[PDB]
Amino acid sequence: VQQLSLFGSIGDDGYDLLISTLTTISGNPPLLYNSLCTVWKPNPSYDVENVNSRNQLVEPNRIKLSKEVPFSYLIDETMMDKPLNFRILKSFTNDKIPLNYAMTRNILHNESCSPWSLQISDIPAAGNNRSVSMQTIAETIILSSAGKNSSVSSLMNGLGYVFEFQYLTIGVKFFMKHGLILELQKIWQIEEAGNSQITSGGFLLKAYINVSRGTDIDRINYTETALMNLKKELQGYIELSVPDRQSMDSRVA
């Protein structure tokens, strides 16, 4: 899959406004969502060349397991209660939900496992000046597991990977025109020695479109336009820009 995207940010200050605005531009409400991502690297004990049985220069990369956490495993207070995601995010700022996230990695709270989104991405498309961030993603869905060691952690080890780092993200997304999505988000590093919000101070803004093609230059070029239109329409309110490629490279590093 091809993910064309634009990024930016707002302090928690700007959120309230941005929201009211984004709802009008898109005509849909923001919808509350979250997801945990667990990153894995090749087992540093094993060691392998960078070539195939089909002499191909192939680089080691990280794997990313992603999925939803039902909010019941995430939220601090019922008193706050409510359905509203933005006023709720202030509640979440600076610091962690229950987490300790290890628990879920190996079941608990005699067990099989969930579905995951197993992904691996390449550095965004080399480009002298790109109007948009264009990134390739290889994905498969894991449906459930079976066998002796059926915990997701066992599975990853069986395949020769090792857990590297992880993070939770909670936000609202806007469903929009021609597959355009806008996520207003917050990210939290999850370690065993406690959790900290990566996005502390505000929200990561991501406007994107996943395209099935890649090899339909036309739909690719259409997609560029879509993103451009957005950045443009909001220009003078918020700049959507292309992130540094180097900063989106999940390789060995």
Partner 1 sequence: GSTYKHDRGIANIRNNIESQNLDLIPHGTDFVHSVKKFLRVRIFTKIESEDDYILSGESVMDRDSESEEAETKDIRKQIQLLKKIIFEKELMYQIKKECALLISYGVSIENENKVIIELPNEKFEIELLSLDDDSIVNHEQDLPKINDKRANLMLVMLRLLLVVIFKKTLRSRISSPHGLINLNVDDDILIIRPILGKVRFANYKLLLKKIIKDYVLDIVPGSSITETEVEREQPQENKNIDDENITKLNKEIRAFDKLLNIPRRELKINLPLTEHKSPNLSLMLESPNYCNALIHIKFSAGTEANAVSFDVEDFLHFIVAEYIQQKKV
Partner 2 sequence: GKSAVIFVERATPATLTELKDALSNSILSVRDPWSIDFRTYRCSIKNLPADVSKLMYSITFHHHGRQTVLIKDNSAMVTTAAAADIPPALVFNGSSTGVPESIDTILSSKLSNIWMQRQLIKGDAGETLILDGLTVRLVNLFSSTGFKGLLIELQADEAGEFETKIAGIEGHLAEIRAKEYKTSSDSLGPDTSNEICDLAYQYVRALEL
Partner 3 sequence: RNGPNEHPGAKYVIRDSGDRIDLRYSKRAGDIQLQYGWKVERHIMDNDPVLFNRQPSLHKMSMMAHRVKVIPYSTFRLNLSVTSPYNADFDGDEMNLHVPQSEETRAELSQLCAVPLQIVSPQSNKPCMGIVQDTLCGIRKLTLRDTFIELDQVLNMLYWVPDWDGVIPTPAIIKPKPLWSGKQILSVAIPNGIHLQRFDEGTTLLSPKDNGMLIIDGQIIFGVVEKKTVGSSNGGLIHVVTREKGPQVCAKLFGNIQKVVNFWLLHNGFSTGIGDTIA
Residues of this chain that bind partner 3 (CB under 8 A) = 56-58, 122, 125-126, 128, 217
Q: Closer to partner 2 at the Cβ: 149 or 235? A: 149
Site track 54-93 with partner 2 (rule: CB under 8 A), x = hit: x-x-xxxx----xxx-------------------------
148 binds partner 2 (CB under 8 A): yes
CB of residue 208 vs partner 3: minimum separation in angstroms?
A: 19
- 186 contacts 199 by C-beta, under 8 angstroms: yes
Contact call for residue 29 and partner 2 (CB under 8 A): no
Residue 73 sits in the site that holds partner 1 (CB under 8 A): no
Does residue 107 belong to the site contacting partner 1 (CB under 8 A)? no
Running DSSP on this structure, what letter comes out for residue 89? Answer: H
What distance in Å separates the CA atoms of residue 49 and residue 164, rounded to the nearest whole number?
Answer: 21
* Per-position b or e across 22-59, b if 16+ CB within 10 A of its CB: beeebeeebebebebbbbbbbeeeeeeeeeeeeeeeee
Cβ-Cβ contacts under 8 Å for 81 (sequence gap 6 or more): none
Stretch that binds partner 2, among 19-27, 75-83, 97-105, 112-120 (CB under 8 A): 112-120
Is the Cβ of residue 79 or residue 111 nearer to partner 2 in the bound state?
111
Cα separation, 18 vs 184, whole angstroms: 9
- Whole-number Å distance between alpha carbons of 215 and 194: 44
| 217-250: burial string, b at 16+ Cβ within 10 Å, e else | eebbeebbebbeebbeebeeebebebeebeebbb
Using CB under 8 A as the binding rule, the residues of this chain from 120 to 149 that contact partner 1 are: none
Contact partner at residue 35 from partner 2, partner 1, partner 3, none, CB < 5 to 8 Å by partner kind = partner 2
**Binding status of residue 49 toward partner 2 by CB under 8 A:** yes
| Contact residue for partner 1 among 162, 179, 245, 249 (CB under 8 A) | 179
The C-alpha atoms of residue 6 and residue 198 are separated, in whole angstroms, by: 19
CB of 31 to partner 1, least distance (A): 5
Task: Calculate ∠ Cα 16-20-22, nearest 5°.
Answer: 110
> Among partner 2, partner 3, partner 1, none, what binds residue 83 when CB lies within 5 to 8 Å by partner kind?
partner 1
> By C-beta, is 126 or 143 nearer to partner 3?
126
C-beta closer to partner 3: residue 2 or 104: 2
Amino acid at site 154: S
Where do contacts with partner 1 occur on this chain (CB under 8 A)?
A: 28, 31-33, 71, 83, 175, 179
